[PDB]
Amino acid sequence: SDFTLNGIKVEDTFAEAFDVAGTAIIVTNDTPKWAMIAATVMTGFATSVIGCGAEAGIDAELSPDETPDGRPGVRILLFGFEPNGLKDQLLKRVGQCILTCPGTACFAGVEGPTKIKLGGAIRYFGDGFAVAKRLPDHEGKMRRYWRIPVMDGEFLCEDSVRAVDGAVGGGNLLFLGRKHADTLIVAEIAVEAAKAIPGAILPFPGGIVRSGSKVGGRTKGMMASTNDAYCPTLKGRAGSALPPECGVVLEIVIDALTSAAVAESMRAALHAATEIGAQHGLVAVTAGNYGGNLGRHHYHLRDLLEKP
């Protein structure tokens, strides 16, 4: 039953992930500095879909070659429960975090089956002065963009953005370690490994979560409560799932446009953490599950053994 990876104990559990609506947008600016500013203000306040509006993250920085604009850009993902709630959140965030940022321009990030109106709705801030243009892109496909007049110039925004089907969120694996300062470093180099997978992001601050989201609760209609089992202050008593050597636990949550990306992002995090884990006191690695019946996708750590 016990599993050992790179000399560090790994529990024989699975990560319970859920099906989610996901979409991607490419935001470009004249400089990469302001491309990042625009994305950073858009991704903020988006660590969970249940409390925050959505789950947002920056997938990758784009060079002037990887972009339809020809200007340095940013590929930024957004996830939500329902395709309507996702549309509602994208409209709010693009409208007041992208449109407001100077010199920006919004394009559709990923290809998908369902359509989401973006430029066609922000066009109404133009007060009837906005115009629409249709142009074939570098691949040969006819795309429609809106031109909203603003103080700095024109905010060009593609009419529609596509939402990919089968985007998976909630894939997580948590680390148990002796000391906060050192074990944070283990998780830090763990998120750096996971970020690299295309189409996958980590919404929480720096990718790391310190509050253990537990389903249910002790009193009345608790929807979420802290995970008393993995709390170091509640050690020694029955119901604490961590050994006496452990003193700090940190969780890593991954969302991705494709299910395979969730598994590959977890695998890379699982390996990178254990390789350096012994040096910084990493005791063990487990995954968060809810019982098996809540979430469709199960990411067993036993399948993540193969090196990347």
Next chain:
Amino acid sequence: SDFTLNGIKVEDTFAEAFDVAGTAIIVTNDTPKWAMIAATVMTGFATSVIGCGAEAGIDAELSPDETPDGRPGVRILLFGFEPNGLKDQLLKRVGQCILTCPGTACFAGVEGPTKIKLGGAIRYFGDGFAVAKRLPDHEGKMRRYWRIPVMDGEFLCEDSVRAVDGAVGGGNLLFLGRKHADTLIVAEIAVEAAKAIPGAILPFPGGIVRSGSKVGGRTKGMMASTNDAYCPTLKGRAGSALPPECGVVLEIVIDALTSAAVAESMRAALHAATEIGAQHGLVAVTAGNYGGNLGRHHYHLRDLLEKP
């Protein structure tokens, strides 16, 4: 008789600012890096109160001396329409951007007459394991803090945060310039001047706005529309408020806990911009007003002539 400062024309208008509910919190972490990560994710998606929940910004970074914790911190402000809406937004943001961030601790930032429950409401995530402690601070005042048990350890959060009365938001002055690339630099060194004033922040991305929020709309019932007068694409026709040399307009919006800070924050930006303005082709500087009857506070540029 329109004022000219440092060789740059300055329009003889006033900035129409409004009274707003404001509060401040101090978030501390073990390293200045993660205090900033905590602050950055909480401030995101808060550029206006009408569309985003609130208007947030980072006032200043605190050293281990300037903090009640003794750990490096960040002083971060939040503004809202109603003290009830302000309370709702602080709870959401601290609950999911501070609590979730590892190694953090939330303290009351500013002193004020009205009280806002902050720690006393997040304590319910503790699922009955959270405890309260009363301790006198370095000034001699008894303060009450909550200790919520979490995976990394304990999330310490002060029970109540104070909300200052008479916080003013919406103080703004806009720049007219020849070229986007150069005039952005004028606005960039303008926000750096404005940020320095204690108790004042600039909510929009990097402090700058490119979409001129104009009250009303051309057709039907519109709450906000683009400012066609200061749009360079709508030049030459009647109703364009900018000269032919101008080609780019950028707005700077300032919120502050005290009315005087808005004026002093405006003053520093007005002077910093014009000192370097001639170098980058800055044509003129004016301020956005709504008519005089919407906003209580009027910040005339005629009173901001005195050097800082």
Next chain:
Amino acid sequence: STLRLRGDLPERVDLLNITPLALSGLSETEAGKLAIGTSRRGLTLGDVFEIRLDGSDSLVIEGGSARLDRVGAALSQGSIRVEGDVGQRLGEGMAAGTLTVTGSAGPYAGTGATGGTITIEGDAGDHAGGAVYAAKAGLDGATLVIKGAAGDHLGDRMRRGMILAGSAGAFAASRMIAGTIVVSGALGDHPGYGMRRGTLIAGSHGTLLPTFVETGTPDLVFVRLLAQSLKHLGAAQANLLSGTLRRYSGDLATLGKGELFVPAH
């Protein structure tokens, strides 16, 4: 499938529904009897051309006259190549495909064309890309390429699509509903009279309308997109977008949502 023009046309000829899709179904003997003449005496396809047919979506007319009206009209399939000059209404209402003309074209070339590409290696006639009498719109989504020089009223009442002209005559982009016209060289007097929406870009320009105002020299993202679109199609006018341009807002007589770009200096 090749149609070898026997000789000079005695009357105007209507080549509608003489598309490779329609020709494939017909027999070589049966296709010859199809009348294309305007007059009562009429003319059959056999009287005009030497018909060689094969089950293909490609059609080549060897030899052309300025009396070949509606050539390629309503084309939904395949391609038609005219080695010669053509008459009015090149590809009227063309749905999709490609239509290439070696010589010059008559007036109203490209009317109501929805999709596909009409290429005139010669010069275009008056109202090229323009709407016909009582027409709701001129060009309606199809790409129109004139390597030579277009006449007066290029893109007249144009609704959609793109026009790539070498040179253009007077009153270009008049009554324009929407679209994109990039003429690489000279542009006649009074362009865009009554323009509602659209983008007009030219190298040279004549006298402008009083209802056109200059916006300045703005670096716009749309210009970058239009440039990459022209680069990808191999357009000679793609170099015109490389430098900084001077902008003018659409005719203020109507809703002034159109625009005009001309090189700075």
